[PDB]
Amino acid sequence: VKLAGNSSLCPINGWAVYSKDNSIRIGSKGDVFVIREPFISCSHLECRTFFLTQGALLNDKHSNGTVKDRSPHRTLMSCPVGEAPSPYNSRFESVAWSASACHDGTSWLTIGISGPDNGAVAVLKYNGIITDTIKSWRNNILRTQESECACVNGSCFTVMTDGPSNGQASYKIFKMEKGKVVKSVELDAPNYYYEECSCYPNAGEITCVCRDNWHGSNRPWVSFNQNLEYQIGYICSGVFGDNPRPNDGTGSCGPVSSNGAYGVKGFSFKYGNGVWIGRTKSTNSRSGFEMIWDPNGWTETDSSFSVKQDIVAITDWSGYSGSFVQHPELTGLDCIRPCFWVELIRGRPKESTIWTSGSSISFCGVNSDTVGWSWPDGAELPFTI
Amino acid sequence: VKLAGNSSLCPINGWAVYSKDNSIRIGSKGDVFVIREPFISCSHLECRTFFLTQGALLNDKHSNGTVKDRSPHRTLMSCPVGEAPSPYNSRFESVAWSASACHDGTSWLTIGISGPDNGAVAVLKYNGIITDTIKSWRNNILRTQESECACVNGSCFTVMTDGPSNGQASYKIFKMEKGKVVKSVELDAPNYYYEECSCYPNAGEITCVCRDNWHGSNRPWVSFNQNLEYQIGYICSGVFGDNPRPNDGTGSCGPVSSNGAYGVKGFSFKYGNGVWIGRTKSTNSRSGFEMIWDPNGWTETDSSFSVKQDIVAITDWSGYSGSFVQHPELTGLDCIRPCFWVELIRGRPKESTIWTSGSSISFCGVNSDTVGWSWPDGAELPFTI
Amino acid sequence: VKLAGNSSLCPINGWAVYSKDNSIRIGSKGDVFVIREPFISCSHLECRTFFLTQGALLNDKHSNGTVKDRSPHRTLMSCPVGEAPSPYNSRFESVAWSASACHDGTSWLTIGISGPDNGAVAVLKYNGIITDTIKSWRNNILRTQESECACVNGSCFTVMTDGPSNGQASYKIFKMEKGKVVKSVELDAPNYYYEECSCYPNAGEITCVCRDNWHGSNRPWVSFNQNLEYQIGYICSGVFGDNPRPNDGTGSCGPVSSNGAYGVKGFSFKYGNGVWIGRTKSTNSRSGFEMIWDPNGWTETDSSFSVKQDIVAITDWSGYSGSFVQHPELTGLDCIRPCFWVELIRGRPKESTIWTSGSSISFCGVNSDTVGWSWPDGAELPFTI
Amino acid sequence: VKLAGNSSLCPINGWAVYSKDNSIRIGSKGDVFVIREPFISCSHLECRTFFLTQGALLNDKHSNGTVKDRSPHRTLMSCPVGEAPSPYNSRFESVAWSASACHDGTSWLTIGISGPDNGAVAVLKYNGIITDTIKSWRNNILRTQESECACVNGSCFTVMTDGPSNGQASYKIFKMEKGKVVKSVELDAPNYYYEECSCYPNAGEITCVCRDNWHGSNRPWVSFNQNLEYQIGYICSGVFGDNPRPNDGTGSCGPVSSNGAYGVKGFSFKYGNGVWIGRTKSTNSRSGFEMIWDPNGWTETDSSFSVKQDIVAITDWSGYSGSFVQHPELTGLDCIRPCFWVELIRGRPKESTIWTSGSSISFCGVNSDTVGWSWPDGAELPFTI
Ligand SMILES: CCC(CC)O[C@@H]1C=C(C(=O)O)C[C@H](N)[C@H]1NC(C)=O
Ligand SMILES: CCC(CC)O[C@@H]1C=C(C(=O)O)C[C@H](N)[C@H]1NC(C)=O
Ligand SMILES: CCC(CC)O[C@@H]1C=C(C(=O)O)C[C@H](N)[C@H]1NC(C)=O
Ligand SMILES: CCC(CC)O[C@@H]1C=C(C(=O)O)C[C@H](N)[C@H]1NC(C)=O
């Protein structure tokens, strides 16, 4: 039976630690994939970590040059949450240098983009079987969420971007059923930029918090129907959520252009007119991580907030982060539970190695006691090489 | 319930990337089998890659001399598609230096040939249990498909060859039910040569596209009943599909003798009087790969075609390729879906190593948008050794 | 259906060997986790070994400094009993530097404590899903059993300690149902010290044998209701069960203060007014192991006993030991079967390595013939490093 | 439902190759256990290889001295047939330096002997749970089959030996149900010696072919009821089946004393008054292997036979061999199928290594065409060490 997606997000007070894979530490000796862009997605029965391999193991010569983003060798694979991604515990999903995945209650939907920069194709699989294809419409690096798609009532939803990463691009929402595109809509969003959306379902409605790589140090959002009727905006809080970003100050409910160029994949959970913001601790680089509760931050422009929960200290590397959700049919709860993962990037460009990889940690929204701390990657670089 | 095999091949426009195992790249550090002759076969529930190991791991001294084709140590094994063939994820199937495998909807049938050159025996297993045996009848390297057998209505079908590889040999079709031979027929095919057949079911009828190692640079074919009533011929297109081969020119609906000796395992999908040809890009060696749609190529002798889709560039090594199929009972489709795999050979004889192995990529026939590219093996040779 | 916990402990005469993982021996070459604090827990269908990794493999640089007890990298994981804990056979459970786990007949409950020393949080998971949280109430290293919790009639029970490890601390019993705390009670135990409790169910009643780290060389005990109505005491036998301890002499039914400070996790099985004591052979260090039947030792103060069964010789290292139980619904027996495991610690502080790890052996209570022997760790130190 | 064991052995003409694990070849690089005494046993659903590890991996320092037979570190483990025994694919069964195992249709029974030479205990497990114990009655190396036990009608049967290995010992048959001994009988066999019995069921009757280590170069046999009513004897053929042995000549229906001392574990299948003999090719050492059909060899004393099928050449090492069986409920056949495995020993004492291990090959009885060949171990010694 299908995941309803009809209930609201659980009330929460903080975030309890959920998983830590220790991947890079283990890959010093173990046969562990070089990966980036990991993400978590759950069904009605399990939770899996999905990741983009570089088709190479850590501490091996084929990990050379793995700071490079796209190659014919990158593949989407998955393993049980909290396990080190290995060729001996990993399920092959798709050939992909950009990906999304989610479960509708019946089967896994996966989305894998591969092919040339000027004509990439998204391959959609339902239960490991190809069901559809989406071809680049702007012939400039077709790219998707790098986190879980959202499912409501047997329909799953995703965002894709095509075009420049330093200017106006083109953004589309896709509605799919059983891995087939049944509807899609291009966003009429002049002056907006959408990329690497973290999307979650909330009472029949999908909310995406994305990355403005163009000219925004605050995060853009889309909220849409099962019909793809949408509203757009930026998070107004002066607690800016992108990286890089300026210091906290007066927000905008447009893009904040200081330190607006570039960015990092992130997420936020809308709670009424309040917002839980996951962001790095550093203003410039992908270092540290904290959760911030800003009770009026969705709509109000000030820089004040109620609650900081430390997750990774500034002295340690972080990276991508994304939302995932746990549905009532898995948990037995009467509400949809918010969770998040953080990718902890090690190696290039910031460190002197021949390789780039990431490990993961994850946390779930909880209505009981929690604590801040640092759960950093913990590997000592460089490696034997 | 049994795979019907009663429906036709799906209409398609091109090929979407399905899997890439990255085996050789991973085997630089990971515990990965030295293999050749890999192939994919699906049931009603899963798809598996089958392969012939050399009973040795990559980058280990026992991989020495693995260009050699037949030994008592070669075994047929399988793992989930897209995973690197490892002793920790691989299921043992059979002792074999030549093999075939398929699923009738109930159980896996496997065929493993081992024993001496002058008296090899094919061991047939149904659900991992020995059900029959076929002894060499010409005492000269009994050999079979090195790809999936075809199943129609609880009966599975295979081709075997015995005799010289530089002259007339003897060719037999076998019909088996529950892993037992119930009927077989020797082909009355003077001047023809059949080897390494890629066979697929199409509306109750089996079509095999094979390798003429003797004197044909175009590929021979057999099409046969559930009764083993057959017709034979060669593909007429002047787009020649073997390797080695001459340049494209005037085809024959006999063997094209320039560059006819030797060959490579390949495949083709008959679509009316049209043909999808998988072939190497190079005319001499196993380099590159492309799909070609020739709308009249089954019967017409010209060298013109409609559609080239690149799969591997000439600058990269390929090798064997074969058909596999996905039945309605697995996909939910109303038609049988064509797919193919390519073996990407690395090492001897073309490169200076002590070993020979292959990785795999695969693709499925799709009626939506697709793109050409190169998805090559990607390993850097030589290895530590 | 739920584990009843309503039957009594089986009559037994001795202990039959059950498992040996050979972990450290294998981890000399194999990819094996550095672990400590392992323990066994069974469901109605299987038995699993749980352990606290250091997020590092044996014989790798990240095993450096692993004598250290608590870090953000420590995780609770599990694998089938008797298997070497590897990233390729291990299931991720929780982020934790102190842990407990048990099965109520329906799902696995796990308890993982992580976070800072001055504010650690216990994360409770039911079926891998977070169900509750317990925050440190004395802000001084919240810590739990490091063995299985006890389940009676769909309710599971655990003990936690907070406060100093060289003085009076605070001790609480928790009753949980489906991974949620429904009741808890603080023990009014002046002059007592409770830590690392080994708890087992006996006819609807839970008995814990614990570690007095403060001033007791005999072991303290709690016995409690499904209502958390309790009685407390120390084991009276002059066969002292902690390490360190004095030589056997006149017991107390309070803490025996010679050699009372520090301690080791241990266990005992109450059989009427008799007791089966698992203890080290050495009086000072964690060396050797023996089972002792003292038919009056629960209540009587003498140092005489009936039966020594050797398990590990004094010349070999042991460490932690704990109780586990096998319920009728798993075994088909009419009684609850007592079993125990021993952790065999190797490396720091006693040996010159950069690392500390442990392997495990286990034994089950049997009413047939048994034999004493030595089943030691068997690794030769140091390692390559 | 229980394995009946009520049908007869299938008619056969020869032996078709079934499995080859290539263990030692793979263990040169892969994480593979050092093992000896492997054996195969099947249920109604699968076939598993059982083996005695030395708690150490190949090509690691802990493999030193593994020619030694008995230690506290030896464990019984199992994996799917034809797979290399690894800590990542192996299930832990029992602590044991001598073992037996079989499946009654419901659960796995395992028998593991460990403990001191002068008081070893057999631990019986049903479904991985301890159900019984057998203590040494002669206090001189209690030892069992090192192959599968035989099951008839929910009862399983085994042979054990206690006493000297160069003189009269004591031999017992045990009948067990659900892993519990319900009956046992000591054989009144003066001048006979029984060890390492290969036992199989045939129409409600169990036949064991064993090893006379004392003074027999032909093999002893026991045939017994479900009641344990027995007959004893030696195989009369002048085709002697032990190793060492004299050249073929005039048999005895007592022990043939030339070259009678020592021996090797072997097997034979009784077919009326005929016999299929598995034996080494060499008369002195464990080299080579062949199957011999002697149509009158059970009862007649001559050295003539009808059919030699080569399995391993004299130039290659063999070792232990044993019977296993495949029951109708697994195969769908109307008869019980005979199969055998051969252990291929490498290293000490015959080769200069610090270690001893074995790989396995196996074969099944077939009523179709077969072929002789050599399927040897194939590892090149010595190793890195
Ligand atoms: C194409 C532009 C885009 C945003 C700058 O690049 C992303 C940056 C990345 C990053 O900033 O870490 C890694 C992503 N894998 C990459 N996406 C793709 C599909 O290449
Ligand atoms: C026996 C002749 C045949 C065609 C030349 O050789 C094949 C060539 C091969 C090849 O050209 O790559 C590899 C095949 N494994 C081999 N088949 C066998 C069974 O040995
Ligand atoms: C906090 C004090 C406590 C008792 C001395 O330390 C324990 C000692 C240990 C020991 O004596 O081996 C190891 C335990 N992992 C540790 N517990 C924690 C949670 O750190
Ligand atoms: C105890 C005598 C017996 C026969 C000589 O030794 C056997 C010889 C062996 C052999 O000849 O290879 C290996 C067996 N593992 C061993 N059995 C035990 C239990 O140690």
Ligand SMILES: [Ca+2]
């Ligand atoms: Ca930005």
Ligand SMILES: [Ca+2]
């Ligand atoms: Ca040719």
Ligand SMILES: [Ca+2]
């Ligand atoms: Ca103490």
Ligand SMILES: [Ca+2]
């Ligand atoms: Ca003998």
